[PDB]
């Protein structure tokens, strides 16, 4: 209702770098809020695409940002009569970026990896990897939990069980408040999908450069399955954390599997042991239900609510005709040990091919009325098709069907304005939480400030 669309701030990265594909607020030890931006097609120093990360300090005028440096050199290790290989070409560094305390985790989901042993190999495959950085000290660590040293043959001999070769770890990511980093690897277990968890502190303390295969004893990976419903389900395409069992001592994970059960799609709520607590099934095949997930309390009862996005949902229209618009599903959490029921509200896009619900961002209490609010992205929405982000204020009844405010893309066609979103943080220190919107097609980020 009160995000200022006139007074915007534009941050820009280099051409073709997809600056703004991912972003987050980062807060230094002093308290100063900055914006971390992922740019997964940034050219490395040798003119080859590696991707990159930028750390923007808050300015009204915005502009260019400094690059947060990472090692972009490939590595080889001849150890244990094997040959370990890392490949950072086209790795997509910054495809996801998340901040926790004084640490920034930027992932390269398509970093490849191989192991050679005589005439045999494990196969050169995208295991993914995440680069952890602590800017105020300079410390760097990495985390790449799907790397293995098992040869091609042994997988064949074991009917491809526990095959982590195609994980794409860090495809999605979130950190708990305690400091557990959770990564989505939708290519895990032969495209079934998996989650990898590990304390940020333990990732730092077990990492040394050049080792390539090391143990993080505290880490916890999800499980492989022979259930056909899970095959090619991309479990971990999106990921989030919240409180859904009523026990503050434990943390619950929300995982998106958008092609689960023959492209029906699904979102699951799990405990930290990866036991299923509830499963939300998709409504319509190929709608990509689970592309986006958001956790926040919108009705002011203290219990976190769930928001799932299905950006390719086709709505029914006159004369049996379907129209791809996108849909967001709101699930309010009830009291006591009770399951999440049917959706309390369905929000459906209006523009054809608009991909409404491609991103859903908790804004916090935007208008400071007691209820939390959210923003939903329609990256090709609006009459022009340029893109559109829609603000929805919360209330006792859940959310409003009618949006309180609509932000139109200030960038040209193709920008993907709204593909990334983040809020619930006061960047200018005026007492109201603000919103950052990425437009990777345009290589830019737009900051909107909340006013009284």
């Amino acid at each position: 209702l009160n995000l200022d669309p006139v007074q915007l701030t534009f941050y820009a990265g280099p051409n073709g770098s997809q600056f703004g594909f991912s972003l987050d607020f980062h807060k230094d030890s002093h308290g100063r809020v900055a914006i971390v931006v992922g740019a997964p097609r940034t050219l490395g120093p040798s003119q080859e695409e590696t991707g990159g990360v930028f750390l923007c300090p808050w300015r009204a005028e915005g502009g260019q940002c400094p690059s947060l440096l990472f090692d972009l050199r490939d590595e080889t290790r001849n150890v244990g009569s094997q040959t370990l290989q890392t490949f950072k070409a086209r790795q997509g560094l910054g495809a996801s970026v998340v901040s926790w305390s004084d640490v920034i985790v930027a992932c390269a989901p398509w970093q490849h990896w191989n192991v050679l042993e005589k005439t045999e190999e494990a196969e050169k495959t995208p295991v993914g990897s995440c680069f952890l950085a602590q800017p105020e000290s300079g410390r760097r660590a990495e985390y790449s939990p799907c790397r293995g040293n098992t040869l091609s043959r042994i997988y064949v001999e074991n009917d491809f069980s526990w095959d982590k070769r195609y994980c794409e770890a860090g495809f999605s990511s979130v950190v708990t408040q305690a400091g557990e980093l959770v990564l989505g690897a939708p290519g895990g277990y032969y495209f079934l999908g998996l989650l990898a968890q590990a304390p940020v502190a333990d990732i730092f303390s077990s990492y040394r450069p050049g080792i390539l295969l090391w143990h993080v004893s505290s880490q916890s990976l999800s499980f492989d399955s022979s259930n056909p419903e899970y095959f090619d389900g991309y479990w971990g395409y999106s990921v989030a954390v919240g409180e859904f069992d009523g026990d503050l001592n434990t943390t619950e994970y929300v995982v998106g599997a958008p092609t689960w059960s023959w492209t029906l799609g699904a979102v699951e709520i799990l405990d930290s042991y990866y036991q299923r607590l509830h499963r939300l099934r998709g409504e319509q095949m190929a709608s990509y239900f689970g592309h986006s997930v958001a956790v926040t309390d919108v009705n002011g009862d203290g219990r976190h609510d769930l928001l799932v996005g299905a950006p390719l949902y086709m709505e029914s229209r006159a004369d049996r005709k379907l129209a791809e618009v996108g849909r967001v599903y709101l699930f309010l959490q009830p009291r006591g040990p009770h399951a999440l029921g049917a959706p309390s509200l369905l929000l459906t896009g209006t523009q054809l091919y608009g991909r409404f619900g491609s991103a859903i961002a908790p804004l916090g209490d935007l208008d400071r009325d007691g209820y939390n609010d959210i923003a939903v992205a329609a990256p090709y929405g609006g009459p022009s098709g340029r893109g559109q982000v829609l603000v929805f204020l919360g209330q006792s009844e859940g959310l409003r069907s009618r949006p309180s405010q609509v932000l139109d893309s200030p960038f040209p066609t193709g920008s993907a304005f709204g593909f990334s979103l983040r809020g619930a943080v006061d960047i200018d220190d005026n007492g109201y939480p603000d919103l950052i919107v990425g437009a990777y097609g345009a290589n830019q980020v737009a900051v909107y400030r909340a006013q009284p």
Partner: antibody
Amino acid sequence: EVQLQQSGAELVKPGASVKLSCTASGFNIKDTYVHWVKQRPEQGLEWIGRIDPANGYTKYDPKFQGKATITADTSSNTAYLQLSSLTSEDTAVYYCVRPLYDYYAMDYWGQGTSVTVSS
Amino acid sequence: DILMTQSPSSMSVSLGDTVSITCHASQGISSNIGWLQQKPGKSFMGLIYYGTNLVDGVPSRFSGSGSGADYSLTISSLDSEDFADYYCVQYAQLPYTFGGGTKLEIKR
């Protein structure tokens, strides 16, 4: 606290077999490779082999192929070394080892098990 | 197999000294070397892994160095506790192979 707890001293007869054990404490045996090493005063340290208890796959020095069989059991967090066809040369102190972080390293050791072959 | 030749086999040194123990491989082993300690009548304790990295809890006075086929362990300022046997081990290739050892002895 990581700690490898090996079985006590063995006094065995030549020709027989013996089976030494190595039990994890403060961690799970399937967490890393587990190695076995031989020590003698004159001949020094010799690497016998390793096992990956998660799947049972093993590797051996040709010198100990056939004599030494390494196994492991995750239900009891224990790895084992079995030496068949005991000879005087098998009289040694036997250690189990695992790495700290590096997959291929040899950082944590058991207290050792003394094996004496005699008639 | 890779032959690891450790030198010297023993040295007579004093408290506060800085000593070094060299270890030569029969071929290049790209820092894939460990350093072990065995105190009299006790078991083994890891000191260095992958050439230069100290094992958790190992005192700063220990340090590794080298490359290719030639590596060194350096204890700076000897403690009474440091009079023990020390071994190198390579893991560039299976089978893993050990040096002969070095015994630090009290000079008198």
